[PDB]
Amino acid sequence: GLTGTGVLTESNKKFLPFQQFGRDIADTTDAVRDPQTLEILDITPCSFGG
Amino acid sequence: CGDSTECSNLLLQYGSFCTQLNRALTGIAVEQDKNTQEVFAQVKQIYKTPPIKDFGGFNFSQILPDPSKPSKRSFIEDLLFNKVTLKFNGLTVLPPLLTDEMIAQYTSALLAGTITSGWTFGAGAALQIPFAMQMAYRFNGIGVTQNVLYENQKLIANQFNSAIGKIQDSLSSTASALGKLQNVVNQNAQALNTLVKQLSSNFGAISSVLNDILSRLDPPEAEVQIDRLITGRLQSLQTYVTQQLIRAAEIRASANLAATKMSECVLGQS
Amino acid sequence: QTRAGCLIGAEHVNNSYECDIPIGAGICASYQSIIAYTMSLGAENSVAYSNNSIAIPTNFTISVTTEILPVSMTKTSVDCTMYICGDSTECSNLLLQYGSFCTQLNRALTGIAVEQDKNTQEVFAQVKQIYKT
Amino acid sequence: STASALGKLQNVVNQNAQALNTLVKQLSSNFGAISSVLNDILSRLDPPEAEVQIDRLITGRLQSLQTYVTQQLIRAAEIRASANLAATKMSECVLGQSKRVDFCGKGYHLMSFPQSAPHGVVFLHVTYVPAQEKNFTTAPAICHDGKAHFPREGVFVSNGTHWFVTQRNFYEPQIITTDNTFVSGNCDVVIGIVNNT
Amino acid sequence: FNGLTVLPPLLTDEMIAQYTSALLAGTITSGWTFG
Numbered sequence A: 001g002l003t004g005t006g007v008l009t010e011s012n013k014k015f016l017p018f019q020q021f022g023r024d025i026a027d028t029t030d031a032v033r034d035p036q037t038l039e040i041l042d043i044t045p046c047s048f049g050g
Numbered sequence B: 001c002g003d004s005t006e007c008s009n010l011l012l013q014y015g016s017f018c019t020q021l022n023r024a025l026t027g028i029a030v031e032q033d034k035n036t037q038e039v040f041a042q043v044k045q046i047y048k049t050p051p052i053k054d055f056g057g058f059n060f061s062q063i064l065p066d067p068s069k070p071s072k073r074s075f076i077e078d079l080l081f082n083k084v085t086l087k088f089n090g091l092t093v094l095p096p097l098l099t100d101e102m103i104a105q106y107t108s109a110l111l112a113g114t115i116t117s118g119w120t121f122g123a124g125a126a127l128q129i130p131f132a133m134q135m136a137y138r139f140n141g142i143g144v145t146q147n148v149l150y151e152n153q154k155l156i157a158n159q160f161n162s163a164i165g166k167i168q169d170s171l172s173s174t175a176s177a178l179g180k181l182q183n184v185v186n187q188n189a190q191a192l193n194t195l196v197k198q199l200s201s202n203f204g205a206i207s208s209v210l211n212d213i214l215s216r217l218d219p220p221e222a223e224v225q226i227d228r229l230i231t232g233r234l235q236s237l238q239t240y241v242t243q244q245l246i247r248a249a250e251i252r253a254s255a256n257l258a259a260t261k262m263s264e265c266v267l268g269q270s
Numbered sequence C: 001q002t003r004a005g006c007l008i009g010a011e012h013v014n015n016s017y018e019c020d021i022p023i024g025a026g027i028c029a030s031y032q033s034i035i036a037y038t039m040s041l042g043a044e045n046s047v048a049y050s051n052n053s054i055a056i057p058t059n060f061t062i063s064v065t066t067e068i069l070p071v072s073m074t075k076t077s078v079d080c081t082m083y084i085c086g087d088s089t090e091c092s093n094l095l096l097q098y099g100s101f102c103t104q105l106n107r108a109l110t111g112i113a114v115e116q117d118k119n120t121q122e123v124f125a126q127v128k129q130i131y132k133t
Numbered sequence D: 001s002t003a004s005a006l007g008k009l010q011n012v013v014n015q016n017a018q019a020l021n022t023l024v025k026q027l028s029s030n031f032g033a034i035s036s037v038l039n040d041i042l043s044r045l046d047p048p049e050a051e052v053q054i055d056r057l058i059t060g061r062l063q064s065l066q067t068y069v070t071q072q073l074i075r076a077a078e079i080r081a082s083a084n085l086a087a088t089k090m091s092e093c094v095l096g097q098s099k100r101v102d103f104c105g106k107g108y109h110l111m112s113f114p115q116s117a118p119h120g121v122v123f124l125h126v127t128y129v130p131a132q133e134k135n136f137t138t139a140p141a142i143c144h145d146g147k148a149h150f151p152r153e154g155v156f157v158s159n160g161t162h163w164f165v166t167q168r169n170f171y172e173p174q175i176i177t178t179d180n181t182f183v184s185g186n187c188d189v190v191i192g193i194v195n196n197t
Numbered sequence E: 001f002n003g004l005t006v007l008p009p010l011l012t013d014e015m016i017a018q019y020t021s022a023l024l025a026g027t028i029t030s031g032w033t034f035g
C-alpha cells in the first residue's frame, strides 16, 4: 500500500522489530521492509537534471 | 505537477510563468559568480614566496600556505573551514565556478606580493624591497619618523608575533565568532526546507496527493481540486523566488564592500 | 565526465588557457573543434626577494582607461482599468469590489519615475555656472 | 572599431524590453475561462456566468501586473545604488585628485574627464605607470663619525662603488649631503648600517 | 498599445551635453579650484 517510484538498493539500516518503513525529514520515505523476506531496502529517486 | 498529464494540461493555460522564474534564478546565479570573481581576482600574476624567509624577525608561519596538507591551505584557513559546518524534488544545486583551491591560490598570491613588494605590485610591476624598510615607509606614512622603527625593531617584531599567536588561540577556542557566514548558510537551508515542506499542505482541496484525487473522483470536479492545488503551489513558489531576490541584493552590497576593502587596504595604506 | 555533470561533443586537453565559456567546477570550454580544459589563474613568477636589494623605476608611461556606469532607466506608466478591463463597464464594476489594488501600483510607478529624474539631476548638475573654453 | 564594449547599458535596455514584452503577451491567456477576449464573453452569454468568467480573467491579470511591479521596484533599487556610486566618482575623481588606491583607474591617478552616454556616463581616467626597472644594493642608514644618518625623503642606493639618495619613484641619484639627511643616535642599534662618508 | 505609456525625461540630452562641456572646460582651465 506504499507506492512510489525510484531505484531500490540493499541497505544496512536496522529497523527495530515493529517498524515497517522509515523517513528522514520533511516526510520523505527512504527505507522499506519487504513483507516476505523481512529485510531493509533503500529507495533513491530516479536521476534527473537540466 | 510531479508527473501527471492532467496536471500539465491544466497548467498549460497559465501562461509563461516558468520562463520568468527560471530567468530570475539564472540571473541570481550569474551574479554570484561575478561577485566572487570581482572580489578575489585582483592580480594578474601568481607570485611565490622565496624559500628562505628572513623578514627582519617578523614571522608569518601561521598564514603562509602549508604544502604538507593536500588542501594547500594555511593554519588559520583550516581552522576557519573546520569552524563553520552545514537533487531531491525537482530542485537542484549548482556548483560554483571557482574551486576552493583556486581561492587559496589567489589568497597566497596576494600575501606573497604584499610581503615581498610592498604596495608597488598593485600599480604595475612588483618591485623588491626588504621588509624592514617597507615597515619604515609605513610608519613614515602615519606621522611617525622612520627613526623610531629601526631603534625598536625587536620589540615591534615580538609584539607582532604575540598578537598573531593570540588571534590564533582566540579563534581556535572561542566559538560564535563567525555568526554572519553561519547565518547565511542557515537562512538558505531553512528557505529551501520550508519550500519542500509546503508540498504536504491541502489548500482547501480534499487531499494533498494527486493520485488519490484522480483515483477517487470523476474529471468534472477532479479538475477543480487540481486547480486549487496548482494555484497554492504556484503562489508558494513565487514567494520563495521573491525572497531569494531580496537576499541576493543584500549579499551583492556586502560583496561590493568587501572588494573595496581588499583593494584599498591590502594593496595600499589607507 | 566532470564534477558538474557529463559532457558530449568536446575534447579534453591537458593544457590550460584563459576561460572563454564557463562550465563549472573549475573547467570551461572554447572553440579551436570545441575543447574543454581547466582554467588558468594567470602567469607564474617569483619575485627575487633579498634583504639588501631594491628595484627602482627609470621611465614611465601615461595610460588612459574607460569606466562605464548606468545612471537611469526609462520611465513607464501603466493604467489598471484599461489593462485588465479594456473599456468594459461590467469589468470595471466587478473590479471595484477589490478595494484599492490600483492606487498602489500607480503610486509605485510614479515614485520610480521621479527617482529616475532625481538620479540624473544629482549625477550631472554639479556646478553653478556654465564655463566656456 | 571594437564593439560590445557597452554591455551594461545594453543589458539594462534589454531587461526592460523583455519585461514589457512578457507583460503584454500575458494578455492572451485563458486562465481557465472559456476565452481570452472579454468582448466575446460579453457577447456570447448572460451576466450571471459572465461574472464567473470575468472573475477568472481579473484574478489572472492582477497577478501578472503585481509581479511586474515588484520586479520593477527591485531593478530601480539596483539602478539607484549604481547612480549614487557614479555621483561619488564624479565628485572625487573629476573635481579633485584621489588618493584611495584603484578607486578610479589602475595606477597613480592624475585626472579624469566625463562623457555622456544614452543612459549613463563614461569616465576617462589618466594614470601614471612606472616602467623600466633596475636593481640596486640598499642600506637603512649610514654610520659616519659614530653617528647614524637617515634620509629625509628618498632611499640610499649604490651602483657597486658609491652611494646616493634617490626619490622612491624615479631614479635620480644625488651626492649624500648633510642637507638631505638627519641624524639621531650612534651606529650601534641599527641592523644593517653601513660605513660611508 | 493597451495602457502602457513612456514618459520623456526632464533633462534633454542637449542639456546633459552642456553640463559635461561645462565640467570639462572648468577642469581644463582652473584645475580643482572651481570645485
Ligand SMILES: *[C@@H]1O[C@H](CO)[C@@H](O[C@@H]2O[C@H](CO)[C@@H](O)[C@H](O)[C@H]2NC(C)=O)[C@H](O)[C@H]1NC(C)=O
Binding pocket: A035, A036, A037, A038
Ligand atoms: C513465506 O513463505 C516462504 C516459503 O516457505 C518462506 O521462504 C522460506 O524462508 C525460510 C527462512 O529462511 C527458508 O529457509 C526457506 O528456504 C524459504 N523457502 C522459500 C520457498 O522461499 C518465507 O520466509 C515466508 N515469509 C514470511 C513467513 O514472512
Ligand SMILES: *[C@@H]1O[C@H](CO)[C@@H](O[C@@H]2O[C@H](CO)[C@@H](O)[C@H](O)[C@H]2NC(C)=O)[C@H](O)[C@H]1NC(C)=O
Binding pocket: B059, B060, B061, B062
Ligand atoms: C614562527 O612561529 C611558529 C609558531 O607556529 C614557530 O613554530 C613553532 O616553533 C616551536 C619551537 O621550535 C615549536 O615548539 C612549535 O611546535 C612550532 N610550531 C609549529 C606549528 O610548527 C616557528 O619556529 C617561528 N619561526 C621561527 C623562524 O622561529
Ligand SMILES: *[C@@H]1O[C@H](CO)[C@@H](O[C@@H]2O[C@H](CO)[C@@H](O)[C@H](O)[C@H]2NC(C)=O)[C@H](O)[C@H]1NC(C)=O
Binding pocket: C059, C060
Ligand atoms: C622612456 O620611454 C620613452 C618611450 O617609451 C622613450 O622615448 C622613445 O625613445 C626612442 C629612442 O630614443 C624613440 O625612438 C621613440 O620615438 C621615443 N618615444 C617617444 C614616444 O617619443 C625614452 O627614451 C625612454 N627614456 C629613456 C631615458 O630611455
Ligand SMILES: *[C@@H]1O[C@H](CO)[C@@H](O[C@@H]2O[C@H](CO)[C@@H](O)[C@H](O)[C@H]2NC(C)=O)[C@H](O)[C@H]1NC(C)=O
Binding pocket: B128, C046, C047, C048, C054, C055, D133, D134, D135, D136
Ligand atoms: C637584479 O638582480 C637580481 C639578481 O642578480 C635579478 O634576479 C633574477 O631573478 C630571476 C627570477 O628570480 C632569475 O631568473 C634570474 O636568474 C635572476 N638574476 C640573477 C640571479 O642574476 C633581477 O632580475 C635583477 N633585476 C631586477 C630589476 O631586480
Ligand SMILES: *[C@@H]1O[C@H](CO)[C@@H](O[C@@H]2O[C@H](CO)[C@@H](O)[C@H](O)[C@H]2NC(C)=O)[C@H](O)[C@H]1NC(C)=O
Binding pocket: D159, D160, D161, D162
Ligand atoms: C657608479 O657611479 C659612479 C658615479 O656615476 C661611477 O663613477 C664615475 O665613473 C665614470 C666612468 O669612468 C668616471 O668618469 C667618473 O669619474 C666616476 N666618478 C667618480 C666620482 O669617480 C662608477 O663608475 C659607477 N660604478 C659602476 C660599477 O658603474
Ligand SMILES: *[C@@H]1O[C@H](CO)[C@@H](O[C@@H]2O[C@H](CO)[C@@H](O)[C@H](O)[C@H]2NC(C)=O)[C@H](O)[C@H]1NC(C)=O
Binding pocket: C051, C052, D191, D192
Ligand atoms: C641579510 O642576509 C645575509 C645572507 O642571508 C646575512 O648574511 C649572513 O650574516 C651572518 C652573520 O654575519 C653570517 O653568519 C652568514 O654567513 C651570512 N650569510 C651569508 C650567506 O654569508 C645578513 O646578516 C642579513 N642581514 C643584513 C645584511 O642586515
Ligand SMILES: *[C@@H]1O[C@H](CO)[C@@H](O[C@@H]2O[C@H](CO)[C@@H](O)[C@H](O)[C@H]2NC(C)=O)[C@H](O)[C@H]1NC(C)=O
Binding pocket: D194, D195
Ligand atoms: C666602520 O668603521 C668603524 C671604525 O672606522 C669600524 O669599527 C671598528 O671595527 C673593528 C672590527 O670590528 C674594531 O677592531 C675596531 O676597534 C672598530 N673601531 C671603532 C672606532 O669602533 C666598523 O667595523 C666599520 N664597519 C664595518 C661594517 O666594517
Ligand SMILES: *[C@@H]1O[C@H](CO)[C@@H](O)[C@H](O)[C@H]1NC(C)=O
Binding pocket: C012, C013, C014
Ligand atoms: C594528457 O591527456 C591524455 C588524454 O586527454 C591523458 O590520457 C593523459 O594522462 C594526459 N597527460 C599526459 C601527461 O599525457
